[PDB]
Amino acid sequence: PDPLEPRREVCELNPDCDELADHIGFQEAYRRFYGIA
C-alpha cells in the first residue's frame, strides 16, 4: 500500500492543489499549499 494515499486524497480535494499536482506533482504541490516554507 502507498503511505501517501491519505495526502494524495487531501490534495485532490483541494481544486487548487489538484490542478497544480498535474504540473509539478503531488508531493511538491501538497508542500506548496500545506507545508511550512
22 scored as a contact of a copy of itself (CB under 8 A)? yes
16 scored as a contact of Ca ion (CB under 5 A)? no
> How far from each other are the two terminal CA atoms of the chain, in whole angstroms?
29
Q: Are 35 and 20 in contact (CB under 8 A)?
A: no
Residue with Cβ nearer a copy of itself (24 or 33): 24
Residue with Cβ nearer a copy of itself (1 or 15): 1
The sign one gets for the Cα dihedral 19, 23, 26, 28 is: negative
Residues that bind Ca ion (CB under 5 A): 12, 18
Binding residues for Ca(2+), by number, are 5, 9, 12, 18
